[PDB]
Amino acid sequence: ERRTFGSYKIEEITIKIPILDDGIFDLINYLLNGTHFDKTHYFDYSHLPTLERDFNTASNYVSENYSIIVEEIDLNKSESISLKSPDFTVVLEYFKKVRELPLLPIMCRESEDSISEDILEGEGAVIQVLKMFMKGFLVHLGENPNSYDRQLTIEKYRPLLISIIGYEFTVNHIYYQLATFDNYPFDLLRFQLQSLIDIKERIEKDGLFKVITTTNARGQYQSVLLRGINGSESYLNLKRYRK
Amino acid sequence: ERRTFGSYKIEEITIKIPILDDGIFDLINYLLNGTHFDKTHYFDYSHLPTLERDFNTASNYVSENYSIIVEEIDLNKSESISLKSPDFTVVLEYFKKVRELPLLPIMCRESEDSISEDILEGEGAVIQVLKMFMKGFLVHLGENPNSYDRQLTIEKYRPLLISIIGYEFTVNHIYYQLATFDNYPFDLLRFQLQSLIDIKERIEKDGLFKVITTTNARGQYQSVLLRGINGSESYLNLKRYRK
Numbered sequence: 001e002r003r004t005f006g007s008y009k010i011e012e013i014t015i016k017i018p019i020l021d022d023g024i025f026d027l028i029n030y031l032l033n034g035t036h037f038d039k040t041h042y043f044d045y046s047h048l049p050t051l052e053r054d055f056n057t058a059s060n061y062v063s064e065n066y067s068i069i070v071e072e073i074d075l076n077k078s079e080s081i082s083l084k085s086p087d088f089t090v091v092l093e094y095f096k097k098v099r100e101l102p103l104l105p106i107m108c109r110e111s112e113d114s115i116s117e118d119i120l121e122g123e124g125a126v127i128q129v130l131k132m133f134m135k136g137f138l139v140h141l142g143e144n145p146n147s148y149d150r151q152l153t154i155e156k157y158r159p160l161l162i163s164i165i166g167y168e169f170t171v172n173h174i175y176y177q178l179a180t181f182d183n184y185p186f187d188l189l190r191f192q193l194q195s196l197i198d199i200k201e202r203i204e205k206d207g208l209f210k211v212i213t214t215t216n217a218r219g220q221y222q223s224v225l226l227r228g229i230n231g232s233e234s235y236l237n238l239k240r241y242r243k
Numbered sequence: 244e245r246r247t248f249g250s251y252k253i254e255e256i257t258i259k260i261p262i263l264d265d266g267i268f269d270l271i272n273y274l275l276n277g278t279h280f281d282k283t284h285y286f287d288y289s290h291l292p293t294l295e296r297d298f299n300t301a302s303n304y305v306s307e308n309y310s311i312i313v314e315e316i317d318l319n320k321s322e323s324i325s326l327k328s329p330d331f332t333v334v335l336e337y338f339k340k341v342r343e344l345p346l347l348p349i350m351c352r353e354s355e356d357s358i359s360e361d362i363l364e365g366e367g368a369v370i371q372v373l374k375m376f377m378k379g380f381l382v383h384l385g386e387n388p389n390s391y392d393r394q395l396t397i398e399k400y401r402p403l404l405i406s407i408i409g410y411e412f413t414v415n416h417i418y419y420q421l422a423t424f425d426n427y428p429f430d431l432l433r434f435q436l437q438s439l440i441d442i443k444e445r446i447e448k449d450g451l452f453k454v455i456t457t458t459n460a461r462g463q464y465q466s467v468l469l470r471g472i473n474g475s476e477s478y479l480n481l482k483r484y485r486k
Binding site: 145150151181183184185187188190191229230232234 | 388
């Protein structure tokens with residue numbers, strides 16, 4: 001059952017069609033439950049040093065901010081996580097027999113010296129857990145090729161990738177390209193992975209995000225776009241993850 | 244109605260979903276009908292010089308080899324072309340109220356000095372029409388971006404791309420990469436297009452194609468694979484094109 005940090009799994013479900021078991025759902029579940037790295041699904045992490053150092057410190061902040069949401073939780077009252085970008089807003093949908101959780105709020109913080117070390121340190125560790133999961137994914141990708149790879153995309157790893165480039169900016173070209181091109185095939189990415197070795201003025205001159213906001217009585221809906229490495233102002237939508 | 248040589252068209256069919264009007268179906272129809280470049284759908288072709296010189300000379304060979312297939316054609320007896328690779332085998336499926344046509348046979352020709360100029364010249368012009376259509380496609384791609392581009396792939400331009408790299412070999416890194424990665428997104432390709440500027444020994448040491456052949460009484464089925472720029476021995480399947 002145990003798999004290395006960041007590693008995916010290609011599932012065959014005969015209708016044998018590929019289904020990516022990205023494992024993001026797990027990462028959030030463990031952090032929200034505040035599990036220590038010593039007793040997880042997650043081996044020789046020489047490629048990922050300070051993984052237990054940064055996993056636990058992030059697990060602290062994620063669980064401590066979840067207990068606030070859990071303070072008003074019921075005994076009689078799901079495990080089908082969803083993720084909003086760029087604030088890394090964990091979306092929980094509870095059943096009787098819905099709340100948000102922005103782990104890395106990039107969009108709103110005009111309080112530089114006001115963000116305390118009890119909040120700031122935990123985020124610095126949440127981006128280091130995210131950065132390491134993506135390094136752990138690209139390592140597993142490059143390491144093992146497969147015939148179904150050509151039928152797979154970076155599409156589910158977007159919120160992780162956006163929050164990585166986002167925090168770094170408001171507080172890497174490979175992370176940026178990957179965040180812009182969610183349509184990236186697994187086989188093409190493996191091929192071009194080592195070839196990706198190199199701040200664009202215009203994109204930084206206008207920032208990474210556009211926030212289109214509309215109203216209509218009950219209506220008050222925002223929509224975040226991402227200024228891409230190509231230029232494309234791509235829409236950022238909520239990504240759902242299952243067991 | 245008139246469009247530049249190689250240019251595609253993104254169609255919106257509200258269910259508005261993207262549908263690529265690649266225009267390959269046209270190219271073959273014109274060549275089989277042996278139409279001259281002077282009276283076609285196909286502008287200032289400064290980027291494609293010797294286009295009428297090479298279109299007509301190819302149109303000659305394609306029509307002259309079609310008249311052989313048409314010699315045994317009926318008065319009472321479709322326009323839904325299909326393409327087999329790597330021999331550039333045009334597949335026609337006729338109705339009463341099915342034949343092949345290998346325009347560029349790369350797979351079988353142990354007759355070097357035996358291929359006459361009445362055949363050889365026409366093929367050299369058929370690969371020059373194919374090469375120019377793909378140059379004409381990448382020019383149109385780079386020239387005009389679109390929001391649906393991210394939902395489009397090189398997948399239908401494969402037989403053209405395979406025959407280009409195939410003839411060149413049995414008689415370009417950008418054509419090769421494109422032939423290997425049929426899963427190439429339009430937006431990613433545009434982004435990396437000018438970045439593609441540079442013969443791998445191993446791939447040439449084993450050649451570009453593998454030909455798996457099996458038998459079973461009525462059975463006698465071949466299957467061509469393509470040794471990719473990444474290594475991948477990808478299956479080459481028949482591609483169908485409509486009006």
